[PDB]
Design an enzyme around this catalytic site. Structure first.
Site, PDB file in Angstrom:
ATOM      1  N   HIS A   1       6.280  13.678 -11.354  1.00 30.48           N
ATOM      2  CA  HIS A   1       7.459  13.797 -12.207  1.00 30.48           C
ATOM      3  C   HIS A   1       7.531  15.174 -12.854  1.00 30.48           C
ATOM      4  O   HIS A   1       7.308  15.321 -14.057  1.00 30.48           O
ATOM      5  CB  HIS A   1       7.468  12.708 -13.286  1.00 30.48           C
ATOM      6  CG  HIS A   1       7.714  11.331 -12.752  1.00 30.48           C
ATOM      7  ND1 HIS A   1       6.739  10.591 -12.119  1.00 30.48           N
ATOM      8  CD2 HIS A   1       8.829  10.565 -12.748  1.00 30.48           C
ATOM      9  CE1 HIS A   1       7.241   9.425 -11.755  1.00 30.48           C
ATOM     10  NE2 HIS A   1       8.509   9.385 -12.122  1.00 30.48           N
TER      11      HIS A   1
ATOM     12  N   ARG B   1      21.948   7.304  -9.134  1.00 32.05           N
ATOM     13  CA  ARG B   1      21.333   7.942  -7.966  1.00 32.05           C
ATOM     14  C   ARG B   1      22.162   7.726  -6.705  1.00 32.05           C
ATOM     15  O   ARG B   1      22.206   8.596  -5.837  1.00 32.05           O
ATOM     16  CB  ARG B   1      19.900   7.472  -7.752  1.00 32.05           C
ATOM     17  CG  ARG B   1      19.023   7.754  -8.943  1.00 32.05           C
ATOM     18  CD  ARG B   1      17.556   7.809  -8.567  1.00 32.05           C
ATOM     19  NE  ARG B   1      16.820   8.668  -9.491  1.00 32.05           N
ATOM     20  CZ  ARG B   1      16.184   8.247 -10.579  1.00 32.05           C
ATOM     21  NH1 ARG B   1      16.186   6.960 -10.912  1.00 32.05           N
ATOM     22  NH2 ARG B   1      15.550   9.123 -11.346  1.00 32.05           N
TER      23      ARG B   1
ATOM     24  N   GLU C   1       2.581   9.964  -8.533  1.00 29.62           N
ATOM     25  CA  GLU C   1       1.385  10.277  -9.324  1.00 29.62           C
ATOM     26  C   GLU C   1       1.091   9.249 -10.421  1.00 29.62           C
ATOM     27  O   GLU C   1       0.132   9.413 -11.180  1.00 29.62           O
ATOM     28  CB  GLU C   1       1.511  11.689  -9.932  1.00 29.62           C
ATOM     29  CG  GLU C   1       2.040  11.800 -11.374  1.00 29.62           C
ATOM     30  CD  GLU C   1       3.547  11.693 -11.467  1.00 29.62           C
ATOM     31  OE1 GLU C   1       4.144  12.434 -12.277  1.00 29.62           O
ATOM     32  OE2 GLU C   1       4.133  10.881 -10.721  1.00 29.62           O
TER      33      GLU C   1
ATOM     34  N   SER D   1      -2.263  -3.129  -8.212  1.00 29.40           N
ATOM     35  CA  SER D   1      -2.196  -2.665  -6.834  1.00 29.40           C
ATOM     36  C   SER D   1      -2.260  -1.143  -6.733  1.00 29.40           C
ATOM     37  O   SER D   1      -2.377  -0.596  -5.636  1.00 29.40           O
ATOM     38  CB  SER D   1      -0.912  -3.171  -6.181  1.00 29.40           C
ATOM     39  OG  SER D   1      -0.954  -4.576  -6.026  1.00 29.40           O
TER      40      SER D   1
ATOM     41  N   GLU E   1       0.738   3.227   8.269  1.00 25.97           N
ATOM     42  CA  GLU E   1       1.415   2.192   9.040  1.00 25.97           C
ATOM     43  C   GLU E   1       2.379   2.790  10.053  1.00 25.97           C
ATOM     44  O   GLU E   1       2.519   2.247  11.149  1.00 25.97           O
ATOM     45  CB  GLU E   1       2.162   1.227   8.120  1.00 25.97           C
ATOM     46  CG  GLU E   1       1.263   0.354   7.246  1.00 25.97           C
ATOM     47  CD  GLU E   1       0.579  -0.768   8.010  1.00 25.97           C
ATOM     48  OE1 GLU E   1      -0.172  -0.479   8.966  1.00 25.97           O
ATOM     49  OE2 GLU E   1       0.792  -1.944   7.647  1.00 25.97           O
TER      50      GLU E   1
HETATM   51  C1  LIG Z   1      12.281  18.942  -1.393  1.00 24.61           C
HETATM   52  C2  LIG Z   1      11.967  17.554  -0.830  1.00 24.61           C
HETATM   53  C3  LIG Z   1      13.003  16.547  -1.337  1.00 24.61           C
HETATM   54  C4  LIG Z   1      12.338  15.567  -2.306  1.00 24.61           C
HETATM   55  C5  LIG Z   1      13.397  14.652  -2.931  1.00 24.61           C
HETATM   56  C6  LIG Z   1      12.749  13.816  -4.039  1.00 24.61           C
HETATM   57  C7  LIG Z   1      13.768  12.854  -4.663  1.00 24.61           C
HETATM   58  C8  LIG Z   1      13.014  11.760  -5.426  1.00 24.61           C
HETATM   59  C9  LIG Z   1      13.973  10.936  -6.295  1.00 24.61           C
HETATM   60  C10 LIG Z   1      13.398   9.524  -6.489  1.00 24.61           C
HETATM   61  C11 LIG Z   1      13.520   9.071  -7.951  1.00 24.61           C
HETATM   62  C12 LIG Z   1      12.550   7.908  -8.204  1.00 24.61           C
HETATM   63  C13 LIG Z   1      12.532   7.520  -9.689  1.00 24.61           C
HETATM   64  C14 LIG Z   1      11.132   7.021 -10.084  1.00 24.61           C
HETATM   65  C15 LIG Z   1      10.741   5.794  -9.246  1.00 24.61           C
HETATM   66  C16 LIG Z   1       9.211   5.654  -9.174  1.00 24.61           C
HETATM   67  S1  LIG Z   1       8.618   4.044  -8.728  1.00 24.61           S
HETATM   68  C17 LIG Z   1       7.183   4.446  -7.656  1.00 24.61           C
HETATM   69  C18 LIG Z   1       7.092   3.548  -6.411  1.00 24.61           C
HETATM   70  N1  LIG Z   1       5.736   3.574  -5.836  1.00 24.61           N
HETATM   71  C19 LIG Z   1       5.413   2.899  -4.717  1.00 24.61           C
HETATM   72  O1  LIG Z   1       4.293   2.895  -4.207  1.00 24.61           O
HETATM   73  C20 LIG Z   1       6.546   2.101  -4.073  1.00 24.61           C
HETATM   74  C21 LIG Z   1       5.967   1.243  -2.944  1.00 24.61           C
HETATM   75  N2  LIG Z   1       5.607  -0.088  -3.458  1.00 24.61           N
HETATM   76  C22 LIG Z   1       4.744  -0.889  -2.815  1.00 24.61           C
HETATM   77  O2  LIG Z   1       4.191  -0.573  -1.762  1.00 24.61           O
HETATM   78  C23 LIG Z   1       4.492  -2.251  -3.497  1.00 24.61           C
HETATM   79  O3  LIG Z   1       5.610  -3.117  -3.275  1.00 24.61           O
HETATM   80  C24 LIG Z   1       3.211  -2.932  -2.982  1.00 24.61           C
HETATM   81  C25 LIG Z   1       3.380  -3.330  -1.511  1.00 24.61           C
HETATM   82  C26 LIG Z   1       2.019  -1.980  -3.125  1.00 24.61           C
HETATM   83  C27 LIG Z   1       2.924  -4.191  -3.805  1.00 24.61           C
HETATM   84  O4  LIG Z   1       1.590  -4.628  -3.515  1.00 24.61           O
HETATM   85  P1  LIG Z   1       1.011  -6.037  -4.041  1.00 24.61           P
HETATM   86  O5  LIG Z   1       1.951  -6.628  -5.019  1.00 24.61           O
HETATM   87  O6  LIG Z   1      -0.398  -5.828  -4.425  1.00 24.61           O
HETATM   88  O7  LIG Z   1       1.056  -6.943  -2.700  1.00 24.61           O
HETATM   89  P2  LIG Z   1      -0.266  -7.577  -2.007  1.00 24.61           P
HETATM   90  O8  LIG Z   1      -0.673  -6.699  -0.885  1.00 24.61           O
HETATM   91  O9  LIG Z   1      -1.264  -7.952  -3.032  1.00 24.61           O
HETATM   92  O10 LIG Z   1       0.340  -8.966  -1.420  1.00 24.61           O
HETATM   93  C28 LIG Z   1       1.731  -9.301  -1.576  1.00 24.61           C
HETATM   94  C29 LIG Z   1       2.510  -8.603  -0.464  1.00 24.61           C
HETATM   95  O11 LIG Z   1       1.547  -7.928   0.331  1.00 24.61           O
HETATM   96  C30 LIG Z   1       2.424  -7.434   1.325  1.00 24.61           C
HETATM   97  N3  LIG Z   1       1.678  -6.795   2.403  1.00 24.61           N
HETATM   98  C31 LIG Z   1       0.461  -7.131   2.812  1.00 24.61           C
HETATM   99  N4  LIG Z   1       0.141  -6.323   3.816  1.00 24.61           N
HETATM  100  C32 LIG Z   1       1.165  -5.498   4.027  1.00 24.61           C
HETATM  101  C33 LIG Z   1       1.344  -4.515   4.907  1.00 24.61           C
HETATM  102  N5  LIG Z   1       0.339  -4.283   5.746  1.00 24.61           N
HETATM  103  N6  LIG Z   1       2.474  -3.800   4.942  1.00 24.61           N
HETATM  104  C34 LIG Z   1       3.485  -4.102   4.031  1.00 24.61           C
HETATM  105  N7  LIG Z   1       3.278  -5.129   3.121  1.00 24.61           N
HETATM  106  C35 LIG Z   1       2.121  -5.798   3.149  1.00 24.61           C
HETATM  107  C36 LIG Z   1       3.089  -8.705   1.825  1.00 24.61           C
HETATM  108  O12 LIG Z   1       4.431  -8.404   2.257  1.00 24.61           O
HETATM  109  C37 LIG Z   1       3.046  -9.586   0.577  1.00 24.61           C
HETATM  110  O13 LIG Z   1       4.353 -10.113   0.245  1.00 24.61           O
HETATM  111  P3  LIG Z   1       5.051 -11.255   1.130  1.00 24.61           P
HETATM  112  O14 LIG Z   1       4.833 -10.801   2.524  1.00 24.61           O
HETATM  113  O15 LIG Z   1       6.458 -11.206   0.709  1.00 24.61           O
HETATM  114  O16 LIG Z   1       4.305 -12.463   0.764  1.00 24.61           O
END
Ligand SMILES: CCCCCCCCCCCCCCCCSCCNC(=O)CCNC(=O)[C@@H](O)C(C)(C)COP(=O)(O)OP(=O)(O)OC[C@H]1O[C@@H](n2cnc3c(N)ncnc32)[C@H](O)[C@@H]1OP(=O)(O)O
Length: 253
Positions: A77, A115, A151, A157, A180
């Site tokens: 950020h 956004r 970050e 998780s 993946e």
């Molecule tokens: C100059 C270049 C341009 C650059 C431009 C930049 C612009 C940026 C602007 C953006 C502005 C953003 C504003 C701020 C927003 C920040 S939020 C940050 C987000 N961070 C992240 O990492 C997002 C991704 N989130 C995730 O990955 C979470 O949903 C996770 C998956 C980590 C949640 O994990 P968990 O709750 O611990 O899940 P578990 O593994 O314990 O088990 C539950 C889920 O595991 C999932 N899982 C297990 N293995 C697997 C499996 N291999 N791949 C899948 N998902 C599985 C599985 O789906 C299962 O759910 P179900 O299948 O529905 O039962």
């Protein structure tokens, strides 16, 4: 602001009390700048901004898109990431990201609308039709870039990593998605460059280890170096390191 001072203290390697006042001031000014620009950004001439701003070593990303691999852009950020998003929308096209579902939901809707009005596709981290890391994985497998704020993630998780010499937690997404999908994992930095905006793409991280923690650690190390380069532009006013959490918050994660 006090947590920010205490965090900059982590950043500059001094006890919190001795962090130069001017740095805290400049960091607050950059933060204010972020919000002042965020307010008006949607109404600015995005084409012009896309034409007139530059990104250092953008060819890193482009070659990844030419090779059909897709790409993960992970950044802290710092600066104006929404502006970077606009630059990418203008120079490449719409991309996908994710956002925390703030409270109230009406405010969440406000931010999504915001956004989306910049041209991004925004997925809800929770409560959407489908799980986000499937849409994201699908975006990457279709050879598209995604952007993730990477970050900070102090949940169960989140990945435990060292950051400026102390334990914090960062999201597993960039590494998980890169492992993946095989998508290139480019660190990114944005900062404020005078009255303009500085942005840079860094060499992709090796994902050959298939290990989220080492890779997230390398990513973190780069984030630390880039933040070390522009400490005033990293507006982290929320708690970041594990040690500053209360025992009750230290438990939940
Ligand atoms: C100059 C270049 C341009 C650059 C431009 C930049 C612009 C940026 C602007 C953006 C502005 C953003 C504003 C701020 C927003 C920040 S939020 C940050 C987000 N961070 C992240 O990492 C997002 C991704 N989130 C995730 O990955 C979470 O949903 C996770 C998956 C980590 C949640 O994990 P968990 O709750 O611990 O899940 P578990 O593994 O314990 O088990 C539950 C889920 O595991 C999932 N899982 C297990 N293995 C697997 C499996 N291999 N791949 C899948 N998902 C599985 C599985 O789906 C299962 O759910 P179900 O299948 O529905 O039962």
């Amino acid at each position: 602001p006090e947590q920010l001072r205490r965090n900059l203290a982590r950043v500059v390697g001094k006890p919190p009390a001795d962090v130069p006042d001017d740095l805290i001031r400049a960091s607050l000014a950059s933060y204010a700048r972020y919000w002042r620009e965020a307010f008006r950004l949607p109404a600015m001439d995005h084409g012009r901004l896309g034409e007139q701003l530059d990104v250092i070593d953008i060819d890193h990303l482009w070659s990844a898109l030419d090779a059909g691999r897709g790409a993960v852009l992970a950044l802290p950020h710092s600066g104006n990431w929404d502006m970077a998003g606009v630059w990418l929308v203008q120079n490449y096209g719409p991309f996908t990201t994710v956002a925390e579902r703030l409270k109230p939901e009406s405010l969440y809707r406000r931010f999504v609308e915001y956004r989306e009005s910049l041209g991004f596709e925004v997925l809800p981290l929770t409560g959407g039709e489908r799980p986000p890391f499937e849409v994201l994985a699908e975006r990457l497998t279709d050879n598209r870039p995604i952007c993730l704020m990477a970050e900070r993630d102090l949940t169960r998780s989140g990945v435990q990593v060292d950051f400026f010499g102390e334990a914090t937690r960062m999201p597993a997404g960039p590494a998980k998605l890169a492992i993946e999908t095989g998508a290139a994992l480019f660190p990114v930095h944005c900062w404020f460059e005078g009255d303009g905006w500085g942005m840079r793409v860094y060499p992709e991280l090796d994902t050959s280890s298939g290990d989220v923690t080492a890779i997230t650690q390398a990513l973190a190390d780069r984030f630390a170096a880039n933040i070390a380069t522009y400490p005033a532009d990293w507006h982290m006013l929320q708690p970041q390191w594990i040690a500053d959490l209360s025992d009750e918050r230290r438990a939940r994660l």
